Structure 1
Amino acid sequence: DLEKANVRGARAVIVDLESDSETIHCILGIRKIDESVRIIAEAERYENIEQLRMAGADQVISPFVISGRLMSRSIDDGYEAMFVQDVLAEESTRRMVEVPIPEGSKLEGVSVLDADIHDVTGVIIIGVGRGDELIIDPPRDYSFRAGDIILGIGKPEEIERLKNYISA
Protein backbone atom coordinates (compact mmCIF):
# COMPACT_ATOMS: atom_id res chain seq x y z
CA ASP A 1 0.00 0.00 0.00
CA LEU A 2 3.07 2.23 0.11
CA GLU A 3 4.04 1.27 -3.46
CA LYS A 4 0.45 2.05 -4.46
CA ALA A 5 0.88 5.75 -3.64
CA ASN A 6 4.01 6.36 -5.81
CA VAL A 7 6.75 6.72 -3.22
CA ARG A 8 9.45 5.99 -5.83
CA GLY A 9 8.57 8.93 -8.08
CA ALA A 10 7.92 11.34 -5.21
CA ARG A 11 10.15 14.15 -4.02
CA ALA A 12 9.12 14.24 -0.34
CA VAL A 13 7.15 11.95 1.97
CA ILE A 14 5.41 13.37 5.06
CA VAL A 15 4.76 10.76 7.74
CA ASP A 16 2.30 11.66 10.50
CA LEU A 17 0.50 8.54 11.72
CA GLU A 18 -1.53 7.84 14.84
CA SER A 19 1.39 6.81 17.07
CA ASP A 20 5.16 6.91 17.04
CA SER A 21 5.68 3.16 16.60
CA GLU A 22 3.54 3.35 13.47
CA THR A 23 5.65 6.29 12.29
CA ILE A 24 8.90 4.34 12.71
CA HIS A 25 7.36 1.30 10.99
CA CYS A 26 6.15 3.40 8.05
CA ILE A 27 9.56 5.09 7.78
CA LEU A 28 11.22 1.67 7.61
CA GLY A 29 8.71 0.62 4.95
CA ILE A 30 9.51 3.75 2.93
CA ARG A 31 13.27 3.19 3.21
CA LYS A 32 12.71 -0.36 1.93
CA ILE A 33 11.42 1.08 -1.37
CA ASP A 34 13.36 4.25 -2.22
CA GLU A 35 16.55 4.79 -0.24
CA SER A 36 17.07 8.45 -1.22
CA VAL A 37 13.64 10.10 -0.97
CA ARG A 38 13.20 12.90 1.55
CA ILE A 39 11.19 11.93 4.64
CA ILE A 40 9.67 14.47 7.04
CA ALA A 41 8.40 12.81 10.20
CA GLU A 42 6.58 13.97 13.32
CA ALA A 43 7.52 12.87 16.83
CA GLU A 44 4.66 12.47 19.29
CA ARG A 45 7.16 11.99 22.15
CA TYR A 46 10.52 13.56 22.93
CA GLU A 47 12.35 10.26 23.47
CA ASN A 48 11.66 8.97 19.96
CA ILE A 49 13.46 11.69 17.98
CA GLU A 50 16.78 9.85 17.80
CA GLN A 51 14.93 6.65 16.84
CA LEU A 52 13.04 8.46 14.08
CA ARG A 53 16.32 9.91 12.82
CA MET A 54 18.11 6.55 13.01
CA ALA A 55 15.25 4.82 11.18
CA GLY A 56 15.69 7.16 8.22
CA ALA A 57 13.79 10.44 8.51
CA ASP A 58 15.70 13.42 7.15
CA GLN A 59 13.77 15.94 9.27
CA VAL A 60 11.90 15.28 12.52
CA ILE A 61 9.41 17.94 13.63
CA SER A 62 8.11 17.48 17.18
CA PRO A 63 5.10 19.74 17.84
CA PHE A 64 4.55 18.99 21.52
CA VAL A 65 8.11 19.99 22.45
CA ILE A 66 7.69 23.31 20.59
CA SER A 67 4.31 23.82 22.27
CA GLY A 68 5.70 23.09 25.73
CA ARG A 69 8.64 25.42 25.25
CA LEU A 70 6.36 28.19 23.97
CA MET A 71 3.98 27.61 26.89
CA SER A 72 6.71 27.80 29.53
CA ARG A 73 8.26 30.91 27.96
CA SER A 74 4.94 32.81 27.79
CA ILE A 75 4.36 33.07 31.56
CA ASP A 76 5.72 36.62 31.65
CA ASP A 77 5.02 37.90 28.12
CA GLY A 78 4.62 36.02 24.89
CA TYR A 79 6.74 37.87 22.34
CA GLU A 80 8.55 34.65 21.44
CA ALA A 81 5.35 32.72 20.75
CA MET A 82 4.02 35.72 18.83
CA PHE A 83 7.23 35.82 16.78
CA VAL A 84 7.10 32.09 16.00
CA GLN A 85 3.40 32.07 15.15
CA ASP A 86 3.57 35.24 13.05
CA VAL A 87 6.74 34.63 11.05
CA LEU A 88 5.37 31.37 9.61
CA ALA A 89 1.96 32.56 8.33
CA GLU A 90 1.96 33.35 4.60
CA GLU A 91 -0.09 36.53 5.10
CA SER A 92 2.12 38.84 7.19
CA THR A 93 4.32 41.73 6.10
CA ARG A 94 7.67 40.11 6.97
CA ARG A 95 8.62 36.66 5.67
CA MET A 96 11.27 34.12 6.61
CA VAL A 97 12.98 32.99 3.40
CA GLU A 98 15.92 30.87 2.23
CA VAL A 99 18.11 32.59 -0.38
CA PRO A 100 20.81 30.47 -2.06
CA ILE A 101 24.24 31.85 -2.97
CA PRO A 102 24.88 31.29 -6.70
CA GLU A 103 28.23 30.41 -8.23
CA GLY A 104 30.12 33.44 -9.48
CA SER A 105 28.50 35.85 -7.02
CA LYS A 106 29.97 38.99 -5.47
CA LEU A 107 30.36 37.40 -1.99
CA GLU A 108 32.81 34.54 -2.53
CA GLY A 109 35.07 34.52 0.53
CA VAL A 110 33.56 37.79 1.80
CA SER A 111 33.06 37.88 5.57
CA VAL A 112 29.68 38.75 7.07
CA LEU A 113 31.06 41.92 8.66
CA ASP A 114 32.36 43.31 5.37
CA ALA A 115 29.25 42.13 3.50
CA ASP A 116 27.05 44.46 5.62
CA ILE A 117 23.69 42.94 4.71
CA HIS A 118 21.36 44.68 7.18
CA ASP A 119 22.18 48.32 6.41
CA VAL A 120 22.44 47.86 2.63
CA THR A 121 19.46 45.55 2.01
CA GLY A 122 17.34 45.51 5.18
CA VAL A 123 17.18 41.72 5.63
CA ILE A 124 17.78 40.40 9.14
CA ILE A 125 20.31 37.59 8.72
CA ILE A 126 19.53 35.06 11.44
CA GLY A 127 21.52 32.15 10.01
CA VAL A 128 23.73 30.84 7.23
CA GLY A 129 23.09 27.20 6.41
CA ARG A 130 25.11 24.62 4.53
CA GLY A 131 24.29 20.99 3.85
CA ASP A 132 22.63 19.57 6.95
CA GLU A 133 23.83 22.12 9.53
CA LEU A 134 22.51 25.58 10.38
CA ILE A 135 24.65 28.18 12.15
CA ILE A 136 22.40 30.64 13.99
CA ASP A 137 23.97 34.12 14.47
CA PRO A 138 27.27 33.40 12.69
CA PRO A 139 30.39 35.17 13.96
CA ARG A 140 32.01 38.11 12.21
CA ASP A 141 34.90 36.03 10.84
CA TYR A 142 32.53 33.77 8.88
CA SER A 143 33.60 33.72 5.23
CA PHE A 144 30.89 32.85 2.72
CA ARG A 145 31.04 30.12 0.09
CA ALA A 146 29.25 29.65 -3.21
CA GLY A 147 26.55 27.14 -2.31
CA ASP A 148 25.62 28.46 1.12
CA ILE A 149 22.00 29.15 2.08
CA ILE A 150 21.21 32.49 3.70
CA LEU A 151 18.16 32.34 5.98
CA GLY A 152 16.67 35.78 6.58
CA ILE A 153 13.65 37.85 7.60
CA GLY A 154 12.48 40.91 5.69
CA LYS A 155 9.92 42.63 3.52
CA PRO A 156 9.69 41.21 -0.04
CA GLU A 157 11.19 44.41 -1.47
CA GLU A 158 14.20 43.78 0.78
CA ILE A 159 14.19 40.15 -0.38
CA GLU A 160 14.35 41.30 -4.01
CA ARG A 161 17.11 43.76 -3.07
CA LEU A 162 19.04 40.93 -1.38
CA LYS A 163 18.64 38.68 -4.42
CA ASN A 164 19.78 41.51 -6.71
CA TYR A 165 22.65 42.31 -4.33
CA ILE A 166 24.09 38.78 -4.18
CA SER A 167 23.49 38.19 -7.90
CA ALA A 168 26.32 37.12 -10.19
Structure 2
Amino acid sequence: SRHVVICGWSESTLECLRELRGSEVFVLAEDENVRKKVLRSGANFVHGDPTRVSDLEKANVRGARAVIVDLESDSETIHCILGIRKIDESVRIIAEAQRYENIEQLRMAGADQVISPFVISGRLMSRSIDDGYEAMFVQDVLAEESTRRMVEVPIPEGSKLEGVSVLDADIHDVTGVIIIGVGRGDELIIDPPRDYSFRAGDIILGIGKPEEIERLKNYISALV
Protein backbone atom coordinates (compact mmCIF):
# COMPACT_ATOMS: atom_id res chain seq x y z
CA SER A 1 0.00 0.00 0.00
CA ARG A 2 3.07 2.22 0.17
CA HIS A 3 5.14 3.85 -2.55
CA VAL A 4 8.08 1.93 -3.96
CA VAL A 5 11.16 4.08 -4.75
CA ILE A 6 13.36 3.30 -7.76
CA CYS A 7 16.88 4.73 -8.00
CA GLY A 8 18.41 5.10 -11.42
CA TRP A 9 16.95 4.32 -14.79
CA SER A 10 17.89 1.31 -16.85
CA GLU A 11 16.42 -1.51 -18.89
CA SER A 12 15.90 -3.46 -15.67
CA THR A 13 13.86 -0.79 -13.96
CA LEU A 14 11.95 -0.28 -17.21
CA GLU A 15 10.75 -3.90 -17.11
CA CYS A 16 10.11 -3.47 -13.40
CA LEU A 17 7.72 -0.59 -13.90
CA ARG A 18 5.88 -2.72 -16.46
CA GLU A 19 5.09 -5.24 -13.73
CA LEU A 20 4.21 -2.61 -11.15
CA ARG A 21 1.53 -0.90 -13.25
CA GLY A 22 -1.26 0.32 -10.98
CA SER A 23 1.07 0.79 -8.01
CA GLU A 24 2.61 4.09 -6.88
CA VAL A 25 6.28 4.30 -7.80
CA PHE A 26 8.81 7.14 -7.61
CA VAL A 27 11.83 7.20 -9.88
CA LEU A 28 14.80 9.20 -8.65
CA ALA A 29 17.31 9.75 -11.43
CA GLU A 30 19.41 12.55 -12.86
CA ASP A 31 18.65 11.90 -16.56
CA GLU A 32 15.99 14.44 -17.52
CA ASN A 33 15.60 12.71 -20.86
CA VAL A 34 13.83 9.82 -19.15
CA ARG A 35 11.09 11.93 -17.56
CA LYS A 36 8.45 11.58 -20.29
CA LYS A 37 9.23 7.85 -20.65
CA VAL A 38 8.85 7.40 -16.88
CA LEU A 39 5.52 9.20 -16.77
CA ARG A 40 4.12 7.15 -19.66
CA SER A 41 4.85 4.09 -17.53
CA GLY A 42 2.60 5.28 -14.69
CA ALA A 43 5.23 6.43 -12.22
CA ASN A 44 6.40 9.72 -10.78
CA PHE A 45 9.77 11.19 -11.64
CA VAL A 46 12.05 13.02 -9.25
CA HIS A 47 15.10 14.83 -10.56
CA GLY A 48 18.04 14.26 -8.28
CA ASP A 49 21.22 12.34 -7.62
CA PRO A 50 20.42 9.04 -5.90
CA THR A 51 23.83 9.11 -4.14
CA ARG A 52 23.07 12.44 -2.50
CA VAL A 53 21.26 12.03 0.81
CA SER A 54 19.11 15.14 0.40
CA ASP A 55 17.68 13.90 -2.92
CA LEU A 56 16.80 10.57 -1.31
CA GLU A 57 14.54 12.41 1.12
CA LYS A 58 12.64 14.02 -1.76
CA ALA A 59 11.82 10.57 -3.13
CA ASN A 60 10.54 9.83 0.40
CA VAL A 61 12.49 6.64 1.18
CA ARG A 62 11.20 6.87 4.76
CA GLY A 63 7.91 4.99 4.69
CA ALA A 64 8.57 3.27 1.40
CA ARG A 65 7.66 -0.41 1.39
CA ALA A 66 10.83 -1.02 -0.63
CA VAL A 67 13.68 0.61 -2.53
CA ILE A 68 15.17 -0.75 -5.74
CA VAL A 69 18.66 0.46 -6.62
CA ASP A 70 20.23 0.12 -10.08
CA LEU A 71 22.87 2.69 -10.95
CA GLU A 72 25.74 2.92 -13.46
CA SER A 73 28.37 1.05 -11.44
CA ASP A 74 28.49 -0.97 -8.23
CA SER A 75 30.56 1.85 -6.74
CA GLU A 76 27.72 4.34 -7.12
CA THR A 77 25.14 1.71 -6.26
CA ILE A 78 26.92 1.08 -2.93
CA HIS A 79 27.13 4.81 -2.26
CA CYS A 80 23.34 4.95 -2.67
CA ILE A 81 22.70 2.07 -0.27
CA LEU A 82 25.03 3.72 2.25
CA GLY A 83 22.98 6.88 1.74
CA ILE A 84 19.65 5.09 2.22
CA ARG A 85 20.72 3.43 5.46
CA LYS A 86 21.73 6.83 6.84
CA ILE A 87 18.02 7.62 6.62
CA ASP A 88 16.05 4.38 7.15
CA GLU A 89 17.79 1.35 8.66
CA SER A 90 14.90 -1.07 8.29
CA VAL A 91 13.56 -0.22 4.82
CA ARG A 92 13.87 -3.08 2.32
CA ILE A 93 16.55 -2.60 -0.30
CA ILE A 94 16.88 -4.50 -3.56
CA ALA A 95 20.08 -3.94 -5.53
CA GLU A 96 21.36 -5.11 -8.89
CA ALA A 97 24.93 -6.30 -9.09
CA GLN A 98 26.92 -5.70 -12.24
CA ARG A 99 29.92 -7.80 -11.34
CA TYR A 100 29.82 -11.00 -9.25
CA GLU A 101 32.71 -9.76 -7.14
CA ASN A 102 30.58 -6.95 -5.73
CA ILE A 103 27.71 -8.98 -4.32
CA GLU A 104 29.38 -9.23 -0.87
CA GLN A 105 29.92 -5.48 -0.57
CA LEU A 106 26.32 -4.71 -1.56
CA ARG A 107 24.93 -7.03 1.09
CA MET A 108 27.34 -5.43 3.57
CA ALA A 109 26.21 -1.88 2.84
CA GLY A 110 22.68 -3.02 3.60
CA ALA A 111 20.99 -4.66 0.64
CA ASP A 112 18.37 -7.16 1.77
CA GLN A 113 18.38 -8.81 -1.65
CA VAL A 114 20.88 -8.75 -4.52
CA ILE A 115 19.91 -9.59 -8.09
CA SER A 116 22.62 -10.70 -10.48
CA PRO A 117 21.39 -10.48 -14.11
CA PHE A 118 24.72 -11.13 -15.84
CA VAL A 119 25.32 -14.16 -13.65
CA ILE A 120 21.85 -15.64 -14.20
CA SER A 121 22.12 -14.85 -17.90
CA GLY A 122 25.57 -16.43 -18.14
CA ARG A 123 24.49 -19.60 -16.39
CA LEU A 124 21.47 -19.96 -18.65
CA MET A 125 23.69 -19.45 -21.72
CA SER A 126 26.09 -22.16 -20.56
CA ARG A 127 23.16 -24.51 -19.98
CA SER A 128 21.64 -23.73 -23.37
CA ILE A 129 24.42 -25.21 -25.49
CA ASP A 130 22.44 -28.32 -26.42
CA ASP A 131 18.82 -27.32 -25.75
CA GLY A 132 17.17 -24.28 -24.23
CA TYR A 133 14.84 -26.03 -21.82
CA GLU A 134 16.10 -24.48 -18.60
CA ALA A 135 16.31 -21.03 -20.19
CA MET A 136 12.80 -21.57 -21.58
CA PHE A 137 11.49 -22.65 -18.15
CA VAL A 138 12.91 -19.65 -16.31
CA GLN A 139 11.76 -17.10 -18.89
CA ASP A 140 8.29 -18.66 -18.97
CA VAL A 141 7.33 -18.88 -15.29
CA LEU A 142 8.47 -15.32 -14.70
CA ALA A 143 6.00 -14.17 -17.35
CA GLU A 144 2.35 -13.18 -16.97
CA GLU A 145 1.58 -14.71 -20.35
CA SER A 146 2.38 -18.26 -19.23
CA THR A 147 -0.31 -20.86 -18.62
CA ARG A 148 1.60 -21.96 -15.51
CA ARG A 149 2.43 -19.22 -13.01
CA MET A 150 5.04 -19.33 -10.24
CA VAL A 151 3.34 -18.14 -7.06
CA GLU A 152 4.03 -17.53 -3.35
CA VAL A 153 1.32 -18.81 -1.06
CA PRO A 154 1.50 -18.25 2.74
CA ILE A 155 0.33 -20.87 5.26
CA PRO A 156 -2.00 -19.05 7.69
CA GLU A 157 -2.36 -19.64 11.45
CA GLY A 158 -4.88 -22.37 12.17
CA SER A 159 -4.22 -23.87 8.76
CA LYS A 160 -5.26 -27.50 8.55
CA LEU A 161 -1.76 -28.10 7.19
CA GLU A 162 -0.01 -27.09 10.45
CA GLY A 163 2.18 -29.95 11.61
CA VAL A 164 1.48 -32.07 8.55
CA SER A 165 4.49 -33.50 6.75
CA VAL A 166 5.16 -32.88 3.08
CA LEU A 167 4.50 -36.61 2.45
CA ASP A 168 1.09 -36.62 4.15
CA ALA A 169 -0.18 -33.37 2.65
CA ASP A 170 0.00 -34.87 -0.88
CA ILE A 171 -0.23 -31.37 -2.35
CA HIS A 172 0.50 -32.29 -5.95
CA ASP A 173 -1.95 -35.23 -5.90
CA VAL A 174 -4.63 -33.02 -4.27
CA THR A 175 -4.31 -29.50 -5.61
CA GLY A 176 -2.35 -30.20 -8.79
CA VAL A 177 0.24 -27.57 -7.80
CA ILE A 178 3.93 -28.49 -7.74
CA ILE A 179 5.78 -27.51 -4.56
CA ILE A 180 9.27 -26.43 -5.69
CA GLY A 181 10.08 -25.08 -2.27
CA VAL A 182 9.04 -23.56 1.01
CA GLY A 183 10.63 -20.44 2.46
CA ARG A 184 10.56 -18.75 5.86
CA GLY A 185 12.51 -15.68 6.92
CA ASP A 186 15.40 -15.28 4.49
CA GLU A 187 15.97 -18.98 4.09
CA LEU A 188 14.54 -21.07 1.25
CA ILE A 189 14.59 -24.85 0.82
CA ILE A 190 14.19 -26.11 -2.73
CA ASP A 191 12.59 -29.57 -3.04
CA PRO A 192 11.65 -30.14 0.64
CA PRO A 193 12.31 -33.60 2.17
CA ARG A 194 9.32 -35.87 2.66
CA ASP A 195 9.43 -35.46 6.44
CA TYR A 196 9.42 -31.66 6.60
CA SER A 197 6.44 -30.53 8.68
CA PHE A 198 4.50 -27.36 7.83
CA ARG A 199 4.38 -24.34 10.14
CA ALA A 200 2.31 -21.16 9.96
CA GLY A 201 4.36 -18.42 8.34
CA ASP A 202 6.00 -20.83 5.93
CA ILE A 203 5.66 -19.52 2.39
CA ILE A 204 4.98 -22.11 -0.27
CA LEU A 205 6.68 -21.52 -3.61
CA GLY A 206 4.79 -23.29 -6.38
CA ILE A 207 4.07 -23.75 -10.07
CA GLY A 208 0.57 -24.41 -11.44
CA LYS A 209 -2.46 -23.18 -13.40
CA PRO A 210 -4.51 -20.33 -11.84
CA GLU A 211 -7.26 -22.93 -11.34
CA GLU A 212 -4.83 -25.25 -9.48
CA ILE A 213 -3.62 -22.41 -7.26
CA GLU A 214 -7.12 -21.55 -6.00
CA ARG A 215 -7.59 -25.20 -5.07
CA LEU A 216 -4.32 -24.92 -3.16
CA LYS A 217 -5.34 -21.84 -1.19
CA ASN A 218 -8.63 -23.51 -0.23
CA TYR A 219 -6.63 -26.56 0.82
CA ILE A 220 -4.34 -24.77 3.22
CA SER A 221 -6.95 -22.45 4.74
CA ALA A 222 -8.39 -23.11 8.21
CA LEU A 223 -11.28 -25.60 8.38
CA VAL A 224 -14.10 -23.24 9.49
Please indicate the TM-score interval, normalised by the length of the shorter structure.
Answer: over 0.9
1:75 Cα deviation (Å)? Answer: 0.3
1:74 Cα deviation (Å)? Answer: 0.3
Aligned counterpart, 2:12: none
SS in structure 1 at match of 2:205: strand
Of 145, 150, 168 in structure 2, the residue corresponding to residue 114 of structure 1 is 168
**CA-to-aligned-CA distance 1:83-130 (integer Å, 9 cap, x gap):** 000110111111000000000010111000000000110001000101
- The runs of at least 4 aligned residues of structure 1 exceeding 4 Å deviation read none
Output the CA distance in 2 between the equivalents of 1:34 and 1:94.
38
Output the CA distance in 2 between the equivalents of 1:159 and 1:137.
18
Unaligned runs of 5+ in 2: 1-54
1:20 Cα deviation (Å)? Answer: 0.4
Q: Provide the TM-score with structure 1 as the length reference.
A: 0.99
Output the CA distance in 2 between the equivalents of 1:166 and 1:3.
42
**CA-to-aligned-CA distance 1:52-101 (integer Å, 9 cap, x gap):** 00110000001000010001000010100000001101111110000000
1:7 Cα deviation (Å)? Answer: 0.4
- Give aligned-pair identity as a percent: 99
SS in structure 2 at match of 1:48: helix
Output the CA distance in 2 between the equivalents of 1:66 and 1:20.
17
Output the CA distance in 1 between the equivalents of 2:158 and 2:100.
43
Q: Provide the TM-score with structure 2 as the length reference.
A: 0.74
1:9 Cα deviation (Å)? Answer: 1.8
**CA-to-aligned-CA distance 1:113-149 (integer Å, 9 cap, x gap):** 0000001100010001010000000101101101100
Output the CA distance in 2 between the equivalents of 1:163 and 1:87.
19
1:40 Cα deviation (Å)? Answer: 0.3
Output the CA distance in 2 between the equivalents of 1:159 and 1:86.
17
Output the CA distance in 2 between the equivalents of 1:157 and 1:136.
23
SS in structure 2 at match of 1:152: strand
Greater RCO structure (CA 8 Å; 6+ sep): 1
Output the CA distance in 2 between the equivalents of 1:154 and 1:54.
36
**CA-to-aligned-CA distance 1:146-168 (integer Å, 9 cap, x gap):** 11000000001110000001011
Aligned alpha-carbon RMSD (Å): 0.5
SS in structure 1 at match of 2:152: strand
SS in structure 1 at match of 2:199: coil
Aligned counterpart, 1:157: 211
Unaligned runs of 5+ in 1: none
Output the CA distance in 1 between the equivalents of 2:201 and 2:71.
35
Of 40, 44, 51 in structure 1, the residue corresponding to residue 98 of structure 2 is 44
